[PDB]
């Protein structure tokens, strides 16, 4: 696969769609999902959410030039805002010259929280739980046979205490669950509900919340990119001075939350449209991303930008990225299935890796434009 | 308008649409935009973002029972996830019994950032700017005579310094701009550009970034709700016990960022689909919401929950809410226009107020469920 797509931006939507279909070998049926409006049947839309009266369209695009660990990929994106697809594509083009994007990710581990109140001895109860870990882990894994046989399941438990709250001391257990190719909320909510009575028996507390955490900091995905000064040279500036201006923009986001919010918004301009294109939950991804940005107590940049010893501009993105290939709209929406076909992804973590590569490219594009814009 | 919609949940989408059209007095043409696929023509979609190959639908729904400052409203929502619309409607039904939602908002004030580097005397340069603030403000306002006629414009400037970054001292000016019914990005960006040469003259430094901040903490919208224990009573739980359980849930969110990220995600489940339905930029709203949530130096809850002197449950949501009635896809997308007609809003701050009421409702719905039978 060659994702360069020369001339794409100037082709008609039909000719774009034809080129995609040729490059990938999409069937006629696949192509007709995008050629004709209304690919989401109303009977399906009506079973997705409540009180449905119709459907709402956004444009569906493809970003070009992306390459992930040496493999070319085409990236579907659904969004209303201009410049995003272009910026991504152009930074992807530049990235290719130096090997594309390099990615990695954690195992697909999600937390389930079990909140326990009204214990007079929570610190002691925490050890009583930790001692009985294996028992709790076995109970968690009893019901979801499909998950286990696919090689997922509850791996471990950690327990936290919050002894100072206005509502008294709390204990909070986390089940740590490998959810394989799912986003995982239903899987872990189920397990949290299933172990709650047993934890209550061990601790003597009242269980309250039994619920996933969206701060999915054990489900991290990572991307890297490299850009050389020669690539960034403008009419106004040397490539070197552009790099320095990109580093200046980065330091500005790292110290000022007013800038960091905007900088990170730029990252999510790249990521959220992929999430939408694949039928995934963008509120989950957003909450994980921004909560992770302020894990230190200070709201900072999710990306890093540096100059290496060769003088090259090197960027990183590492962040929570809980996404699924199965479940909900990703299965039921015909175009979500088409997107996954276009992407070629075999695991949810592969989809996560593509996401962070696009977020990183979008951030770079935004910074480059802001740094190279002349003073009027 | 009566927003109650008896049996709406169980009508077909065609019947729900006909019913809305009758309540609102929508034209046959308006109803047609939802009764048929393809309300977003391809020529418009192709002009909205780059590399467009088609469109992508999500379901379009309406939440029922909402009442804001004593007026019933119907709330359009576009999203892929079940239970959101139902939960919002159900909590809105409860809220009606005690007066509905009560809302307010600030003026629609946005920050434009102007980053200045290369100054050995940033603290001095700050006072030189403030000494000449009236000129800077007059200059920003020459740039947009129409906004000023509409009753907006640059109101003030603030200046922040970061004298010790790893990239050297920086100074950052903020233009504080009343943007009326726009989200405002384009307006404030334009002003930042206009004042940049003047700030360079004053400070002797070099302007880098000129750009809005999405941390729109001078554009706050606020909602309140009240719920009695009688309303929350179940077969398994007294209403008083449910209220205690909700307060335990809130305290858990206030202390633990693992919980707060999820709690806040639930609020955004309510808000973002109204943002999408109105053609607004949901990445901006998200970034502002979650960055505001950590302004204290700890990532906490956007909502508050308390029990008043009567034993009643009272909740608040105050947050940044930068949305527009004009600008971008809000104008361009025929269904964004229709949403605004359904909502009946006459200013952007009115839309913002609706948004926080729906966010507050959604949070309440999640918590009520999590404190009683559980989410599953
Ligand atoms: C989903 C409900 C409301 C069902 O509720 P129910 O148990 O079926 O109660 P009901 O069936 O008697 O419904 C009563 C009212 O709910 C509304 N309603 C009820 N069903 C529908 C429907 N199909 N379509 C439209 N409206 C509906 C409707 O207004 C109805 O009034 P009535 O029928 O008496 O006039 C209930 O189970 C509930 O409130 N669940 C909330 C939990 C939830 O799933 N919230 C949604 C978002 S998930 C989320 O935010 C993530 C989370 C939870 O992790 C955030 C966090 O942790 O904080």
Taking phi over 0 as left and psi of -120 to 50 as alpha, with beta for the rest, A65 belongs to left
Q: Are A215 and A225 in contact (CB under 8 A)?
A: no
Tally of domains within chain A: 2
Q: What token pair was written down for A287?
A: 């909450």
**Residue of chain B whose Cα is closest to the Cα of A328:** B81
Nearest CA among B326, B317, B329 for reference residue B353: B317
Residues 74-93 of B with CB under 8 A from A: 77-86, 89
Exposed (0-12), middle (13-18) or buried (19+): which is B124, by Cβ within 10 Å? middle
Site of tokens 């940033």: B122
Nearest CA among A182, A176, A180, A186 for reference residue A215: A176
Q: How far apart are CA B33 and CA B335, in angstroms?
A: 7
The CA-atom distances, in angstroms, between B151 and each of B78, B98, B346 are: 32, 36, 15
A12 C-beta neighbours (distance < 10 Å), count:
12
Nearest CA among A107, A161, A162, A163 for reference residue A130: A161
Closest residue by Cα to atom 36, ligand 1, is B87
Q: What token pair was written down for A248?
A: 């200046």
Residue of A22, A33, A57 to mutate when probing chain B, most B C-beta within 10 A: A57
Q: How far apart are CA A227 and CA A242, in angstroms?
A: 11
Q: Are B257 and A295 in contact (CB under 8 A)?
A: yes
Q: How far apart are CA A177 and CA A187, in angstroms?
A: 9
Contact A301/B at CB under 8 A: no
Partners of B116 in beta bridges: B171, B207
Site to substitute for ligand 1 among B10, B85, B90, most atoms within 8 A of C-beta: B90
Q: Are A178 and A108 in contact (CB under 8 A)?
A: yes
Do residue A272 and residue A369 come from a single domain?
Answer: yes
Method used to solve the structure: X-ray
Do residue A210 and residue A322 come from a single domain?
Answer: no
Q: What token pair was written down for B207?
A: 């302007």
Q: Is A193's CB within 8 Å of B374's CB?
A: yes
Q: What token pair was written down for B279?
A: 């053609």
Q: How far apart are CA B64 and CA B13, in angstroms?
A: 14
Contacts of A245 by beta carbon, 8 Å cutoff, 6+ apart: A237, A371, A372, B208
Site of tokens 């500005």: A252
Please give, one letter per residue, the 3-state secondary structure of B199-221: HHHHHCCEEEEEEECCCCCCCEE
Q: How far apart are CA B192 and CA B211, in angstroms?
A: 7
CA A70 distance to own-chain centroid: 21
Site of tokens 């660990």: A69
Contact A39/B at CB under 8 A: yes
CA B41 distance to own-chain centroid: 27
Residue-wise burial string across A90-114, b where 16 or more C-beta atoms lie within 10 A, e elsewhere? bbbbbbbeeebbbbebbebbbbbbb
Do residue A194 and residue A224 come from a single domain?
Answer: no
Contacts of A289 by beta carbon, 8 Å cutoff, 6+ apart: A264, A267, A268, A271, A302, A319, A320, B290
Q: Are B354 and B343 in contact (CB under 8 A)?
A: yes
Do residue B284 and residue B159 come from a single domain?
Answer: no
Residue A242 phi/psi, 5° resolution?
-60, -45
Q: How far apart are CA B135 and CA B152, in angstroms?
A: 17
Instruction: Fill in the DSSP letter of residue B74.
Output: -
**Which residue blocks in chain B are alpha helix, DSSP H?**
13-24, 28-35, 42-48, 84-96, 122-131, 133-142, 145-150, 185-203, 229-232, 239-255, 257-277, 282-293, 329-332, 334-343, 348-371
Residues 235-274 of B with CB under 8 A from A: 245, 247-249, 251-252, 254-262, 264-265, 268-269, 272
Q: How far apart are CA B354 and CA B357, in angstroms?
A: 5
Of B218, B238, B273, which residue constitutes the final position of a domain?
B218
Site to substitute for ligand 1 among B19, B77, B83, B86, most atoms within 8 A of C-beta: B86
Do residue B193 and residue B57 come from a single domain?
Answer: no
Q: Among the atoms of ligand 1, which is closest to the Cα of residue A185?
A: 54
Is residue A81 part of the annotated active site? The answer reads: yes
Nearest CA among B279, B285, B339, B286 for reference residue A79: B279
* Ligand 1, CB within 6 Å, residue ranges: A 50-51, 211; B 9, 64-65, 83-84, 86-87, 89-90, 93, 262-263, 265-266, 269, 365-366, 369, 375
Rounded to the nearest whole angstrom, what is the distance from the C-alpha of residue B72 to the centroid of ligand 1? Answer: 20
B70 C-beta neighbours (distance < 10 Å), count:
9
Nearest 5 degrees, angle CA B271-CA A87-CA A104? 80
Please give, one letter per residue, the 3-state secondary structure of chain A: CCCCCCCHHHCCHHHHHHHHHHHHCCCHHHHHHHHCCCCCCHHHHHHHCCCEEEEEEEEEEEECCCEECCEECCEEEECCCCCHHHHHHHHHHHHHCCCCEEEEECCCEEEEEEEEECCCCHHHHHHHHHHCHHHHHHHHCCCCHHHHHCCCEEEEEEEEEECCCCCCCEEEEEEEEECCCCCCHHHHHHHHHHHHHHHHHHHCCEEEEEEECCCCCCCEEEEEEEECHHHHCCCCCCHHHHHHHHHHHHHHHHHCHHHHHHHHHHHHHHHHHHHHHCCCCHHHHHHHHHHHHCCCCCCCCCEEEEECCCCCEEEEEEEECCCCCCCHHHHHCHHHHHHHHHHCCCCHHHHHHHHHHHHHHHHHHHHHHHHHCCCC
The C-alpha torsion from A199 through A202 and A204 to A206, rounded to 10°, is: 0
Stated length of chain B: 376
Domain enclosing residue B185, as ranges: 109-218
B25 C-beta neighbours (distance < 10 Å), count:
7
Site of tokens 């008609």: A12
Helix A84-96 with A348-372: angle, nearest 10 deg: 100
Instruction: Fill in the DSSP letter of residue B83.
Output: T
Do residue A242 and residue A138 come from a single domain?
Answer: no
Contacts of B1 by beta carbon, 8 Å cutoff, 6+ apart: B23, B24, B71, B72, B73, B74, B344
Q: Is A62's CB within 8 Å of B53's CB?
A: yes
Residue B353 phi/psi, 5° resolution?
-65, -40
Resolution of the coordinates in A?
1.9
Nearest CA among A61, A181, A199 for reference residue A135: A199
Q: How far apart are CA A267 and CA A285, in angstroms?
A: 12
Q: How far apart are CA B33 and CA B24, in angstroms?
A: 15
CATH number for the domain spanning A283: value is 3.90.770.10
Residue A366 phi/psi, 5° resolution?
-65, -45
Nearest CA among B262, B239, B244 for reference residue A208: B244
Do residue B74 and residue B188 come from a single domain?
Answer: no
Contact B46/A at CB under 8 A: yes
Closest residue by Cα to atom 24, ligand 1, is B9
The CA-atom distances, in angstroms, between A66 and each of A16, A87, A99, A176, A285 are: 17, 12, 10, 33, 21
Do residue B262 and residue B154 come from a single domain?
Answer: no
Is residue B281 part of the annotated active site? The answer reads: yes
B80 C-beta neighbours (distance < 10 Å), count:
23
Selected catalytic residue, list A156, A217, A265, A286: A265
B208 C-beta neighbours (distance < 10 Å), count:
25
Of A218, A240, A273, which residue constitutes the final position of a domain?
A218
Q: How far apart are CA B336 and CA B345, in angstroms?
A: 12
**B103: three-class secondary structure by DSSP:** strand
Instruction: Fill in the DSSP letter of residue B9.
Output: G
Residue B117 phi/psi, 5° resolution?
-120, 180
Partners of B263 in beta bridges: none
CATH number for the domain spanning A138: value is 3.30.70.420
Selected catalytic residue, list B81, B134, B164, B236: B81
Q: Is A111's CB within 8 Å of B376's CB?
A: no
Closest residue by Cα to atom 44, ligand 1, is B83
A124 C-beta neighbours (distance < 10 Å), count:
11
Residue A54 phi/psi, 5° resolution?
170, -165
Residue B57 phi/psi, 5° resolution?
-95, 140
Nearest CA among B108, B118, B257 for reference residue B184: B108
Exposed (0-12), middle (13-18) or buried (19+): which is B213, by Cβ within 10 Å? buried
Exposed (0-12), middle (13-18) or buried (19+): which is A7, by Cβ within 10 Å? exposed
Do residue A201 and residue A57 come from a single domain?
Answer: no
Of A191, A218, A245, which residue constitutes the final position of a domain?
A218
Q: What token pair was written down for A330?
A: 């990703």
Q: Is B20's CB within 8 Å of A257's CB?
A: no
When computed from its CA atoms, the radius of gyration of chain A, rounded to whole angstroms, is 23
**B185: three-class secondary structure by DSSP:** helix
Q: How far apart are CA B372 and CA B365, in angstroms?
A: 11
Q: What token pair was written down for A251?
A: 């330091």
Candidate from A34, A55, A287 with C-beta closest to B53: A34
Do residue B97 and residue B138 come from a single domain?
Answer: no
Q: Are B172 and B113 in contact (CB under 8 A)?
A: yes
Strand pairing report for B75-78 and B52-63? antiparallel
Q: What token pair was written down for A192?
A: 């949290």
Q: What residues in B contact A59, CB-CB < 8 Å?
A: 40, 45-46, 48-49, 52, 54-56
Instruction: Fill in the DSSP letter of residue B120.
Output: S
Exposed (0-12), middle (13-18) or buried (19+): which is B312, by Cβ within 10 Å? middle
| Run of H or E including B178 | strand B170-178
Q: What residues in B contact A373, CB-CB < 8 Å?
A: 210
Residues 119-158 of B with CB under 8 A from A: none
Q: What token pair was written down for A31?
A: 């192509």
Do residue B361 and residue B224 come from a single domain?
Answer: yes
Do residue B175 and residue B226 come from a single domain?
Answer: no
Residues 329-348 of B with CB under 8 A from A: 329, 333, 335
């Amino acid at each position: 696969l060659d994702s360069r797509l020369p001339a794409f931006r100037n082709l008609s939507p039909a000719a774009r769609l034809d080129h995609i279909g040729q490059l990938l070998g999409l069937s006629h049926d696949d192509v007709s999902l995008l050629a004709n409006a209304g690919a989401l049947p109303m009977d399906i839309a009506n079973g997705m959410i409540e009180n449905v009266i119709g459907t709402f369209e956004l444009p569906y695009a493809v970003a070009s030039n992306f390459q992930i660990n040496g493999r070319d990929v085409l990236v579907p994106l659904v969004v209303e805002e201009p410049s995003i697809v272009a910026a991504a594509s152009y930074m992807a083009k530049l990235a290719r010259a130096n090997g594309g994007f390099t990615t990695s990710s954690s195992a697909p581990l999600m937390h389930a929280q079990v909140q326990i109140v009204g214990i007079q001895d929570p610190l002691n109860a925490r050890l009583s739980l930790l001692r009985r870990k294996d028992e709790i882990i076995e109970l968690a894994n009893r019901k979801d046979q499909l998950l286990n046989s696919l090689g997922g399941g509850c791996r471990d438990i950690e327990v936290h205490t919050f002894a100072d709250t206005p509502r008294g001391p709390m204990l909070v257990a986390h089940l740590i669950v490998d959810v394989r190719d799912a986003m995982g909320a239903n899987t872990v909510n189920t397990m949290a509900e299933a172990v709650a009575p047993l934890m209550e028996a061990i601790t003597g507390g009242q269980v309250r919340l039994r619920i996933l955490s969206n701060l999915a900091d054990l489900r991290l995905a990572r991307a890297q990119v490299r850009i050389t000064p020669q690539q960034l040279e403008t009419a106004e500036f040397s490539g070197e001075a552009v790099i320095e201006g990109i580093l200046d923009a980065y330091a500005f986001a790292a110290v000022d939350p007013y800038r960091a919010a905007t900088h990170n918004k730029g990252i999510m301009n790249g990521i959220d449209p992929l999430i939408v294109a694949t039928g995934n939950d963008w509120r989950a991804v957003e909450a994980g991303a921004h909560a992770y940005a302020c894990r230190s107590g200070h709201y900072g940049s999710l990306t890093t930008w540096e100059k290496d010893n060769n003088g090259h501009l090197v960027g990183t993105l590492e962040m929570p990225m809980p996404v699924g290939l199965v479940g909900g709209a990703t299965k039921t929406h015909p175009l979500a299935q088409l997107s996954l076909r276009i992407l070629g992804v075999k695991t949810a973590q592969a989809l996560a890796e593509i996401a962070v590569a696009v977020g990183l490219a979008q951030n770079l594009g935004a910074m480059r434009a802001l740094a190279t814009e002349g003073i009027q």
